[PDB]
Amino acid sequence: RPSGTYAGLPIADYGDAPPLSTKTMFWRTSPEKLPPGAWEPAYLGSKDERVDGPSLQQVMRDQLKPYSEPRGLLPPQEILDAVCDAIENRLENTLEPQKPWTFKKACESLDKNTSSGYPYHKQKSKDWTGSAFIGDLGDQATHANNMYEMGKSMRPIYTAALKDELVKPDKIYGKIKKRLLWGSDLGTMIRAARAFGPFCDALKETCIFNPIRVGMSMNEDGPFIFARHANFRYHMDADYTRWDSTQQRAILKRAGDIMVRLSPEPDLARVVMDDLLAPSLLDVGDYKIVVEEGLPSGCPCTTQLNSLAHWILTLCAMVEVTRVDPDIVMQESEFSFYGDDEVVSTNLELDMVKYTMALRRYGLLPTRADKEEGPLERRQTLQGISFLRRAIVGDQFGWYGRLDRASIDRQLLWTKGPNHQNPFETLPGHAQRPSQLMALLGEAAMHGEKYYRTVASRVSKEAAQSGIEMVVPRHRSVLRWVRFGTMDAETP
Amino acid sequence: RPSGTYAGLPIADYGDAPPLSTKTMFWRTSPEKLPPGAWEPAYLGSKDERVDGPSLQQVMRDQLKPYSEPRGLLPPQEILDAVCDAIENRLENTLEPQKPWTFKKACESLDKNTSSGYPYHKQKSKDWTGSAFIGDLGDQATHANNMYEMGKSMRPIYTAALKDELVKPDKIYGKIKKRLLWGSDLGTMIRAARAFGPFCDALKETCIFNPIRVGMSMNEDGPFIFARHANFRYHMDADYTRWDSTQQRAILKRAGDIMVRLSPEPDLARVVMDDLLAPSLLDVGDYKIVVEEGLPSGCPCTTQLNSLAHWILTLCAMVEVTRVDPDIVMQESEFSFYGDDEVVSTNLELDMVKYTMALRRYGLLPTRADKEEGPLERRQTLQGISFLRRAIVGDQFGWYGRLDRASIDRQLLWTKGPNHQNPFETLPGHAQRPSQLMALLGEAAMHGEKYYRTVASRVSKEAAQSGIEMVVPRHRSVLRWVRFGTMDAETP
Ligand SMILES: [Mn+3]
Ligand SMILES: [Mn+3]
């Protein structure tokens, strides 16, 4: 060890991962022919009756290419230092200090409905008493917790997967594409959660005052978040391609440094962060390969780290171009980050050619709305920019996030259910989606009378040829409940 | 009846009111000489050892003068109709429909620590079981509730008082002035609360989305409210003199019409509103006088009615001058109203001479910051405008309301306690003001290190020569707790 090459990367060891999933969670809501150009669940492999394409394995090899691509340049050192200082300083000024997380708390915080990853590849709930891990997962948890408390290092092992999600038809029938997922190992999950849960909680409570929006409620917080952004003259979205795979570990380490420094157990958190950022072992089935660069997006606290790296790079490009100090940029701007997702608003008069070039030089791949070459565009209205998959809309009552007509139509055409081979199958279960149907009514209401009425029809049929019968409210009642609703819970 | 004149108004009947209060609730926090030009509790009458002035009765007569002053002009009818429609329409779009208030609920909502007014003039708690009124107050409550349910009219009777509050020294030592209070009668309080409590609750839940800010939290809501205002180019405050006494009942009736129309029991609410707005009987001690014009500010739901009248008049003046429809003005503006208190923000290019003239023509008395003649000023920054007795301040974290240095100094010089004759007396009770002292620390923190340190000294002494001993936190800890504090309750 380590010798040999897979998908352009060094092989470190034999693989333990289970075969890639061959099934989808999405079921058609009806037997009718799907409208043309309609989204469908992502490609399912050699058994996919819709097309003859490559193996899931090959598809995965295609996803791994960007990770052997040469890295971009580091932003100038003085700028990088200055923005990191300003960011850490802003977080010191805003974050409520936290108590350390117990092993019990770290264990509780983990999603019990996903895999434990290496080495047991077992749904976490299978070994979960309701308050602790027993059996195989108990051994793994307890050992990792011990390593944590002794400040001892452990090599993380990630398990590769491909995301089951609705994609545009060309990704199925033209050039096939399915998105890479990093499945973290339980040990790592426990260590990361104990180390960084305090930081991430402090950050969530602060997701309106600070640009990292993880843990926000779109309906509850969106109005205030977007009103903040609207206080500034210029608005933009760089719309990055392949964000995760274009990351530099060096940038990620500076992001990690801030997280460590701002944790209640910095010395123990350092050991964990150092493990997270070291050349990553990724299990692709037959092999474990070494992934030296890009984001290892497996963990609990991965989204925060990534959003922090994003904050760094955005401030770097802006400071480099405007020549204004990072702290002053921050008093002339409002940012929203959520992993690769962003809105940047500023009063600063930004040279968009120079800004785009700076981003490209860092190895990032920003893209124009029209998908043609040239500089990123800026506008003087927020209307038309999106965030967390919602369009930002403003009227006489304020700002808010609204799901577009295409996405509402999509959720009406598909429903989540158990895993199965054929997406076009109907879920014969009568299919009770009551809470979901309600939210969908809410989204449609925000589009007007005409649109709401058509969705209300489809929602009725879908509840008619189903179990329960619920009242379908008037437009003006549900509109009032989504926009201003005294709280979220239950109907208008 | 009705014959004879008191304070320029018709006498309707003999008075039943108790003598005007001769005492203040404020006690000096120390025996040291007060700084020169320092605020003091308002004038206490013939027994006030600080000055020889007129009787409280005469002072009251001076307060009653504006109510016999001729009224201003009604805004043009087409405009008035259009703004009322647009206002009622905005409230229909935003307010969650409510269930009627029970007698039990109306009774519970009443402040039990103030007077029952006519005819018993007894603190409400004196007859309060903890869930119902018994004794004299029970008779009064029950009868009024019966009149309410039968849609029967009752003549309200108000009791005049003078506000015990800190005033600038000239109002004590120069031309004496003490502010008029209308003390409503229990019967009226119950009827008004049953009739309009539903409307006022609907409005409170909506105090961020709608311009009537009653029920807002400055710390919790201020940031969002002020961020909304900042979305607009021009900002102003008309800073009205004698708002309540310059009101037209005709304007108040249109305000009342909206409240009625938007209540769950409109026919019963109409009887109550019609009683509220009819020529008012005001008990000044020796007489009950008829007050035909101005605001009868006695009730529970008086502040909402007044804020609504304010909304009407502000929209009227703006529409009259800009020539833009009331609904479009509202999509180009953000207002905040709380009785006479206002902030108006707009993208509309408003002729400030014409706007000031329109307001003056309605009988209002707006005033310039510099207190000289001429037009109201507008600015392009919110910074420097106040609301709910707080300055509006914005930094890199957002907007917020901050109490000024003079007001912080004031609350350090005086403390509330039982009623007594001499303001300069020290409250010998050791004087535990723990919650208050904390908030004051919070306000000072928002002024910087230097100022916070001086206040921290004074707050320590005041806790030292007192009962309890509490930790006095660092500047950066308390600043973090006031601005962003995970919640309000307890310390940083
Ligand atoms: Mn985006
Ligand atoms: Mn004011």
PDB file of N, CA and C and ligand atoms in Angstrom, chain B residues 237 239 340-342 386-388, ligand 2:
ATOM      1  N   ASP B 237     -40.211  61.754  10.422  1.00  0.00           N
ATOM      2  CA  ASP B 237     -41.028  61.712  11.624  1.00  0.00           C
ATOM      3  C   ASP B 237     -41.642  63.088  11.828  1.00  0.00           C
ATOM      4  N   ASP B 239     -43.367  64.191  14.336  1.00  0.00           N
ATOM      5  CA  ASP B 239     -43.222  64.646  15.718  1.00  0.00           C
ATOM      6  C   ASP B 239     -44.374  65.585  16.146  1.00  0.00           C
ATOM      7  N   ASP B 340     -49.694  58.299  18.627  1.00  0.00           N
ATOM      8  CA  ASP B 340     -49.194  59.495  17.945  1.00  0.00           C
ATOM      9  C   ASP B 340     -47.799  59.286  17.367  1.00  0.00           C
ATOM     10  N   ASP B 341     -47.167  58.185  17.760  1.00  0.00           N
ATOM     11  CA  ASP B 341     -45.780  57.905  17.422  1.00  0.00           C
ATOM     12  C   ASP B 341     -45.691  57.311  16.023  1.00  0.00           C
ATOM     13  N   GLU B 342     -44.707  57.761  15.239  1.00  0.00           N
ATOM     14  CA  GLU B 342     -44.599  57.343  13.836  1.00  0.00           C
ATOM     15  C   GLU B 342     -43.185  57.335  13.253  1.00  0.00           C
ATOM     16  N   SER B 386     -36.232  58.286  15.869  1.00  0.00           N
ATOM     17  CA  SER B 386     -36.623  57.475  17.029  1.00  0.00           C
ATOM     18  C   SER B 386     -37.988  56.827  16.875  1.00  0.00           C
ATOM     19  N   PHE B 387     -38.255  55.831  17.720  1.00  0.00           N
ATOM     20  CA  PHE B 387     -39.551  55.160  17.788  1.00  0.00           C
ATOM     21  C   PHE B 387     -39.685  54.384  19.094  1.00  0.00           C
ATOM     22  N   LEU B 388     -40.876  54.440  19.692  1.00  0.00           N
ATOM     23  CA  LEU B 388     -41.112  53.904  21.047  1.00  0.00           C
ATOM     24  C   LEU B 388     -40.019  54.313  22.056  1.00  0.00           C
TER      25      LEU B 388
HETATM   26 MN    MN C   2     -41.703  59.723  17.687  1.00  0.00          MN
END
